[PDB]
């Protein structure tokens, strides 16, 4: 018997202002950049670390 609040829920969603394209795009480029950099750095790190342990 409880009235569904989903109608008022979707109403608030329609009033939500969405960010622009350039901001999200540049942000995605930043995230991808950090991800790639950290990936390469850690790959080289644990790579030469494995190469170091293998000598022992």
């Amino acid at each position: 018997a409880t009235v569904a609040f989903a109608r008022e829920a979707r109403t608030e969603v329609r009033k939500v202002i969405w960010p622009t394209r350039q901001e999200t795009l540049h942000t995605t480029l930043i995230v991808a950049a950090v991800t790639a950099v950290m990936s390469l750095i850690l790959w080289g790190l644990d790579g030469i670390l494995v190469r170091l342990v293998s000598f022992i």
Partner: peptide, 17 residues
């Protein structure tokens, strides 16, 4: 993966003023 990335990035910075 790129699509999910762009999507969640678009959502997290979304706000209601």
């Amino acid at each position: 993966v790129f699509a999910v990335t762009f999507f969640v990035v678009f959502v997290e910075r979304g706000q209601r003023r």
